[PDB]
Amino acid sequence: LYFQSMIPDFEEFTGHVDRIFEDVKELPDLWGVSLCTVDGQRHSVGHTKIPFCLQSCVKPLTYAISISTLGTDYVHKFVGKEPSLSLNEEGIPHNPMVNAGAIVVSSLIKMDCNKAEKFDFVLQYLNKMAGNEYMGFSNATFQSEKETGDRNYAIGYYLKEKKCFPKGVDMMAALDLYFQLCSVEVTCESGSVMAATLANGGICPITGESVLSAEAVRNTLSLMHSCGMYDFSGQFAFHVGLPAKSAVSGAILLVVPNVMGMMCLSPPLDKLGNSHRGTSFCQKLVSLFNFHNYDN
Amino acid sequence: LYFQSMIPDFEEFTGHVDRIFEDVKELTGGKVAAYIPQLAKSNPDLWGVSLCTVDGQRHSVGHTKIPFCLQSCVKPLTYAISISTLGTDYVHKFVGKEPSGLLSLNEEGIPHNPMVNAGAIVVSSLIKMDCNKAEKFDFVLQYLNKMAGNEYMGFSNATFQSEKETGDRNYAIGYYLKEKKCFPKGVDMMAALDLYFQLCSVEVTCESGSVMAATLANGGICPITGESVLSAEAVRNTLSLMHSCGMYDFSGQFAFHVGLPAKSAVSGAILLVVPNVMGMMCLSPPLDKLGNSHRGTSFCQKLVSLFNFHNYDN
Amino acid sequence: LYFQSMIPDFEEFTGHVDRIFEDVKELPDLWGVSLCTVDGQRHSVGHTKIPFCLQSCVKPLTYAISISTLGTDYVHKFVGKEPSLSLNEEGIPHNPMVNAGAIVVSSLIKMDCNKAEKFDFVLQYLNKMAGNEYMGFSNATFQSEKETGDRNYAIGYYLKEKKCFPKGVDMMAALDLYFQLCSVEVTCESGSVMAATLANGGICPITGESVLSAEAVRNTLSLMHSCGMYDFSGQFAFHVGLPAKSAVSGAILLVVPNVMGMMCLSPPLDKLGNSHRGTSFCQKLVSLFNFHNYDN
Amino acid sequence: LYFQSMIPDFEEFTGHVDRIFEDVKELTGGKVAAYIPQLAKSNPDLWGVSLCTVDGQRHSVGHTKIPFCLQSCVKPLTYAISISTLGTDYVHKFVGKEPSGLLSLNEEGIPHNPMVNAGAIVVSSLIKMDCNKAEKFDFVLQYLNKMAGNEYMGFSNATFQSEKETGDRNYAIGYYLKEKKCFPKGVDMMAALDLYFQLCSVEVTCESGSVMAATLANGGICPITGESVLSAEAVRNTLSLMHSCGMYDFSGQFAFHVGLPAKSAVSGAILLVVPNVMGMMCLSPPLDKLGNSHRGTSFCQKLVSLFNFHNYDN
Ligand SMILES: [Cl-]
Ligand SMILES: [Cl-]
Ligand SMILES: [Cl-]
Ligand SMILES: [Cl-]
């Protein structure tokens, strides 16, 4: 019912999406948008079958998995809940959407097990969030972050120094898993289904599978709202007012709660590290359809 | 329809409100700011909650007809008036749109947002710039009256004179804003402070405050009068900034656990908006360390978590 | 004896001073340098009889007077001792050379008395530091700081809010005195004698009068060394290595301990608010004569 | 002549040194860092002071022949070597010249100064860039030997291996410097860390350390050998930065009350320079809250104030 009021006519709605997508082209030239509604209707326009690495787009997914498997109380002994590297007053990374927090979050998953298993455990949730659609792995990107990710090594050693990891966790193992998860590949199409799972309270809308808890989803959407677009997060919360997560790949994972998930891809980044076209497209779509979280 | 799903049964809902109100009485911690024992506003046991739904249903429990000064609760109201009369583009040349950091100016040389004192002082200055002191006040008071559906609205001259004589923090901010050139042309800093102190001294009750909060919950239309008070744009902006900046240093925790637009004040008030459902005003003077009502905050957390009112609840 | 080794031949020394003064002209066009040795020898070149307001150059003088009359222990309950507005860990202005500290310092002087008397009490020390040479007052500058000094009013109200003043002190009275003292006028010639008093352990070298205590002078020279040139203080300490104080008037009060005091005037300021020519002249003079505090 | 005025009578001077050394034994507060009870360096009662005048007179009292690792005391020595071999202009493209703030990079994107770990790591990297690990070490060790007039100089492999295995703070700094591109061309970050950890593990005694400090007091000429070890420019820079950055967060207090170039270390050492008079090395392991020797600092304050050695004493 709520969905029906927000999008009465799907074909008409996709027509407007296409028009905005087109306008935004007035900005390689990779440009794609896919969406998946909470009742499983789909639309892609442009370059939506090209694989690309999740990179930071994975941060809310791993956080949601940690909450789903361990609960809020425990997770947030190790990572904070608000916008900010550095550490906060309690001596922990500010939130799960900044690198230091995402690294700590990564360390929390299946602490009793090895590298291969941790990865496979996360991957099983990601597969289900995507309704078993396209999910790959870029060894090129993985090896590149391993060899050149000095910023993350610096953060890792700092977290270790400040005692920010759970007992018995090897810092280097946690970094290795974090780099692996950043190297998972999706397309706009599969990514949109993941975002739709978050839009749909943690149930994958193309399979009906329960993937994440309501608590995990609520927490994740809250932190995406406030921390999901790096230095542009405040502007985005004000003008667009929806949970989103950006990445250096030029991806934007956007959630419209109880309506749809979307994944946009356009590699060229603005000064704040967010897709120039993706961001502009979100603003135009939300203004036109009154999807802002505080639209009446 | 949407309201019906969020609150299927009003009477049953008010029954839960009453019970939580009662449970929260067990909480006695916190310190009252600017305690004057003769004054009802300083009573640590003052405790009241009122609400007004977007379709005009009402419920009060406890001390809901005791007047108290809006103080910081006026910040989002004056902001909403400025946007409604001048538009986003113009207002936000003079004030920012985001949280500051647990005060200063931002990268563009302007106060971080309308919910911190420096931003609220600038926002005060923007209203009816071509007119005099009396008229600015009356123009704001007319919007406030209408937001409250013409229910109780007073003025505390004692509070006004007290802030004038001892509000050193705000004078420091005022001179700093002047030094950094943060005010519009033709504005006298001292006049803008004077107006800000006046607006902070406007009095409401839980009941009249709840209606102001309901006007925000209802897209800018006062639900007990049908009047179009604020533009939709004004309300949307206001609710966004209340969500992220409305509870001072507790704003992050509140956004995470409660997930609603709220504004706290040193009076121990909490103006809470549940969009498309209701406005609520809670009052309990004893403050926790971050300056927010110990009981009010606890009550909001319990009510919102029981009823799934968090903005991102499924 | 020590002076004799540092400057064996005064006439030869002044000849080099003149040559540097001249070189620096390759930079109104007000430009003057005066010096006064600790044994009372004098040299001026350029515009050394033009009065100008001490402004910030007064900050170390008022601080020295406070120490001389009240002692270190007491003064430094209210003001800190190191480079940094804001307040420090103990809730007090960082040092006497920043505005907030200079304002608090001003408040400490003759607390039991009125405006006129406070001023006259400070003025009696300043007169004696200058060996009774030129000392005036600019009402233009005083009224201008009163009407336009919003930064200082902001600081004043902040100090009052944070309870940084001694008991019973009216903040506005303290600001008024601080603005008055900033408006005291000297020439390069009279100013050089003040600086020579500091170079000579607190005895005015043209009169033999004991003006300030050894403790006051030592403290003052220490803080001038580290805090006396605003954001350029670290560079200056490293390359020049002498106690100096700059002001917005384009003045530089320079002390060469046990050798001489100097006052330079050149109104055009660099980006950090210090006289472009004055600063350059200090660097060249010190490199040539090996006057750096850590020169062997 | 200048020396004669500062210390008119050597024997009388050493007598006062001895008495202050004795008085300071009453101070037992402080905490020993990285306490290993088998190791002499961890003994809270380890207490020694040696000095060497610029004309080569010597005095030791207490535990002055116990080796200990230079740790941070090596920072100003490696810096002085870099300036002496490469010059100010070149070195200070890679490291700043001033105190940081009670860690990060400065406005120009470089470590704040050579006395903080990040600056000392970069300074390490600058030395003999065209050569290998063994040679860099030996080249620095040769200057250190000469600064110490060929007196005691050792190496603790236990300390070196310990920092390699558990120095997480320094690895974090190292990767950050690499990320921000703070090293010269051709330098491997890990090699520079390894060298820095090696130099920190070089051992001296109070006696040999005092001579190194005397070389700095004497314009770069080792006073017990007459050898020209460091350039005048190197020494002047080094003493300036020790004055302002040498005692971590206590540097301001120390500059104000003591007014001399000094460098503290986590070992409880204090290398103190009295220019044109003497070098001194004090050792007492228990540290105050800011990481400086509780007894050493107190002893320096008492000695300097009694003898008027403050740089701005008249
Ligand atoms: Cl790794
Ligand atoms: Cl006023
Ligand atoms: Cl005044
Ligand atoms: Cl290593």
DSSP notation for C88-113: -TTSS-S-TTSHHHHHHHHHHTTTTS
CA dist., res. C1 & res. B70, Å (int): 74
Nearest 5°: CA angle at D249, between D243 and D252?
Answer: 45
Tally the C-alpha atoms within 13 A of residue B19's C-alpha that lie toward its C-beta: 9
Q: Give the contacts of A205 (CB within 8 A, at least 6 positions apart).
A: A36, A37, A38, A39, A40, A131, A193, A196, A197, A199
What are the residues of chain C with a beta carbon less than 8 Å away from any beta carbon of chain B? 150-151, 153-158, 160-161
Q: Are C224 and C56 in contact (CB under 8 A)?
A: no
Q: Do chains C and B touch (3 or more CB pairs under 8 A)?
A: yes
Q: Checking DSSP bridges between strand B202-204 and strand B154-155, what pairing results, if any? A: antiparallel
Q: Tell me: is residue B2 an annotated ligand-binding position.
A: no
SS3 D114: coil
Between the CA of residue A211 and those of A128, A207, C174, C259, D84, what are the distances in Å? 6, 10, 67, 81, 65
Going from the Cα of A146 to the center of ligand 1, the distance in angstroms, rounded, reads 6
Between the CA of residue D216 and those of C119, C267, D70, D276, D309, what are the distances in Å? 46, 39, 16, 9, 16
Q: Tell me: is residue A215 an annotated ligand-binding position.
A: no
Amino acid at A235: Q
Q: Residue A49 has which token pair? A: 């079958």
Amino acid at A129: M
What are the residues of chain C with a beta carbon less than 8 Å away from any beta carbon of chain D? 1-2, 5, 80-83, 89, 200-202, 214, 217-219, 221-223, 225-226, 233-235, 237-238, 241, 243, 257-258, 292-296
Helix (H) or strand (E) holding D83: helix D75-86
Distinct helix (H) and strand (E) counts, chain A: 13, 8
Provide the phi-psi class of A110: left if phi over 0, else alpha when psi is between -120 and 50, else beta. left
Q: Are A131 and A198 in contact (CB under 8 A)?
A: no
DSSP D96: -
DSSP secondary structure letters along C157-197: HHHHHTT-SPTT--HHHHHHHHHHHHTEEE-HHHHHHHHHH
B172·C161 Cβ contact <8 A:
yes
3-state DSSP percent of chain B in helix, strand and coil, to 5: 50, 15, 40
Closest chain B residue to A294, measured at CA:
B236
Q: Which ligand is the nearest neighbour of the Cα of A175?
A: 1
Tell me the β-bridge partners of B155: B202
CA dist., res. A171 & res. A182, Å (int): 17
C160·B168 Cβ contact <8 A:
yes
Q: Are B203 and B70 in contact (CB under 8 A)?
A: yes
Q: Residue D67 has which token pair? A: 């080796």
D237·C241 Cβ contact <8 A:
no
SS3 A282: helix
Closest CB from A218, A234, A292 relative to B310: A218
Closest chain B residue to A6, measured at CA:
B2
B168·C154 Cβ contact <8 A:
no
- Domains of chain D: which residue ranges? 1-314
B/e letters for A253-285, b = 16+ CB within 10 Å, e = fewer, are: bbbbbebbbbbbbbbebeeeebbbbbbbbbbbb
Burial class (CB within 10 angstroms; exposed 0-12, middle 13-18, buried 19+) of C289: middle
Closest CA to C64 of C75, C77, C80, C51: C75
Q: Are B41 and B285 in contact (CB under 8 A)?
A: yes
CA dist., res. A183 & res. D33, Å (int): 42
The set of chains that have 3 or more CB pairs under 8 A with D is A, C
CA–CA min distance D158, chain C (Å) = 37
Residues of B in contact with C154 (CB under 8 A): 172-176, 178-179
Residues of D in contact with C202 (CB under 8 A): 314
CA–CA min distance C78, chain D (Å) = 15
Between the CA of residue B257 and those of A226, B7, B245, B298, D202, what are the distances in Å? 13, 20, 15, 11, 54
Going from the Cα of B203 to the center of ligand 2, the distance in angstroms, rounded, reads 19
Length of chain B in residues, anyone?
A: 314
Angle between helix A99-108 and helix A150-161 axes, rounded to 10 deg: 60
Burial class (CB within 10 angstroms; exposed 0-12, middle 13-18, buried 19+) of A214: middle
C157·B169 Cβ contact <8 A:
yes
Q: Give D95-102's long-range contacts (Cβ < 8 A, gap of 24+).
A: D95/D119, D95/D122, D95/D123, D97/C234, D97/C235, D97/C238, D97/D241, D98/C233, D98/C234, D98/C235, D98/C237, D98/C238, D98/D244, D98/D245, D99/C83, D99/C234, D99/D244, D99/D245, D99/D251, D99/D252, D100/D245, D102/C89, D102/D249
Q: Which residue has the tokens 């505005």?
A: C99
Tell me the β-bridge partners of D282: D49, D270
Between the CA of residue D221 and those of D86, D148, D212, what are the distances in Å? 18, 11, 10
Residues of B in contact with A202 (CB under 8 A): 314
Residues of C in contact with B173 (CB under 8 A): 154
- Give the residue ranges of DSSP H helices in chain C: 2-6, 10-24, 59-70, 72-75, 99-108, 115-129, 139-148, 150-161, 171-182, 188-199, 214-227, 233-239, 276-289
SS3 D38: coil
Q: Residue D97 has which token pair? A: 């010249």
Neighbour count for residue B164 (Cβ, 10 Å): 15
Closest chain C residue to B178, measured at CA:
C150
Tell me the β-bridge partners of D61: D49
Q: Which of A63, A72, A82 to mutate to test the interface with B (most CBs of B within 10 A)?
A: A82
The set of chains that have 3 or more CB pairs under 8 A with C is B, D
D173: Cα separation from own chain's centroid: 20
Amino acid at A243: P
Q: Residue A66 has which token pair? A: 């940690």
Nearest 5°: CA angle at D223, between D220 and D227?
Answer: 60
Technique used: X-ray
Q: Are C261 and C194 in contact (CB under 8 A)?
A: yes
DSSP C275: B
DSSP D101: -
The CATH fold assigned to C1-296 is Beta-lactamase (3.40.710)
B252·A294 Cβ contact <8 A:
no
DSSP secondary structure letters along B243-254: HHHTTGGGHHHH
Q: Give the contacts of D213 (CB within 8 A, at least 6 positions apart).
A: D52, D271, D272, D273, D278, D279, D280, D281
SS3 D246: coil
Helix (H) or strand (E) holding B147: helix B133-147
Longest dimension (CA), chain B: 55
Going from the Cα of A156 to the center of ligand 2, the distance in angstroms, rounded, reads 52
CA–CA min distance A139, chain B (Å) = 36
CA–CA min distance D185, chain A (Å) = 17
SS3 C87: coil
Q: Are A34 and A188 in contact (CB under 8 A)?
A: yes
Closest chain A residue to D174, measured at CA:
A154
Q: Are A134 and D156 in contact (CB under 8 A)?
A: no
CA–CA min distance A289, chain B (Å) = 14
CA dist., res. A263 & res. A249, Å (int): 12
A34: Cα separation from own chain's centroid: 15
Closest CA to B147 of B271, B266, B61, B240: B271
The number of C-beta contacts closer than 8 angstroms across A and B is: 85
Going from the Cα of B163 to the center of ligand 4, the distance in angstroms, rounded, reads 61
Residues of C in contact with D218 (CB under 8 A): 296
Tell me the β-bridge partners of A32: A46, A265
Q: Give D181-186's long-range contacts (Cβ < 8 A, gap of 24+).
A: D181/D109, D182/D94, D182/D105, D182/D109, D182/D110, D182/D111, D182/D118, D182/D122, D183/D94, D183/D122, D183/D125, D184/D94, D184/D125, D184/D126, D184/D129, D185/D129, D186/D129, D186/D130
Handedness of CA D113, D116, D121, D123 (dihedral sign): positive
- Give the residue ranges of DSSP H helices in chain A: 2-6, 10-24, 59-70, 72-75, 99-108, 115-129, 139-148, 150-161, 171-182, 188-199, 214-227, 233-239, 276-289
CA dist., res. C286 & res. D11, Å (int): 36
A81·B253 Cβ contact <8 A:
yes
CA dist., res. A114 & res. A109, Å (int): 11
CA dist., res. C99 & res. C106, Å (int): 10
Q: Give A286-292's long-range contacts (Cβ < 8 A, gap of 24+).
A: A286/A240, A286/A241, A286/A242, A288/A16, A288/A20, A289/A6, A289/A13, A289/A16, A291/A6, A291/A242, A291/A256, A291/A259, A292/A240, A292/A241, A292/A242, A292/B236, A292/B240
Closest CA to B98 of A238, A172, C72, C129: A238
Q: Checking DSSP bridges between strand C52-53 and strand D58-62, what pairing results, if any? A: unpaired
Closest chain B residue to C163, measured at CA:
B168
A157·D171 Cβ contact <8 A:
yes
CA dist., res. B34 & res. C283, Å (int): 56
Angle between helix A171-182 and helix A150-161 axes, rounded to 10 deg: 140
DSSP D182: -
D168·A157 Cβ contact <8 A:
yes
Q: Which of B258, B312, B313 to mutate to test the interface with A (most CBs of A within 10 A)?
A: B312
Closest CB from A154, A156, A158 relative to D179: A154
| Separation of first and last alpha carbons in chain A | 17
- Edge-to-edge strands of the sheet including C251-256? C42-46, C32-37, C260-265, C251-256, C244-246
Q: Are B82 and B220 in contact (CB under 8 A)?
A: no
CA–CA min distance B252, chain C (Å) = 25
CA–CA min distance B256, chain A (Å) = 6
Tally the C-alpha atoms within 13 A of residue D147's C-alpha that lie toward its C-beta: 30
A81·B219 Cβ contact <8 A:
no
Going from the Cα of B87 to the center of ligand 2, the distance in angstroms, rounded, reads 28
Closest chain B residue to A241, measured at CA:
B240
CA dist., res. C286 & res. D181, Å (int): 35
CA dist., res. A191 & res. A170, Å (int): 31
Q: Do chains D and B touch (3 or more CB pairs under 8 A)?
A: no
Q: Tell me: is residue B237 an annotated ligand-binding position.
A: no
Going from the Cα of B153 to the center of ligand 2, the distance in angstroms, rounded, reads 22
CA dist., res. C230 & res. A163, Å (int): 39
CA–CA min distance B171, chain C (Å) = 6
Closest CB from D102, D276, D314 relative to C296: D276
Residues of A in contact with B252 (CB under 8 A): 80-83, 226
Q: Which CATH class is domain B1-314?
A: alpha beta
Q: Are A273 and A21 in contact (CB under 8 A)?
A: no
Closest CA to A170 of A73, A103, A90, A121: A103
SS3 D174: helix
Closest chain B residue to A84, measured at CA:
B101
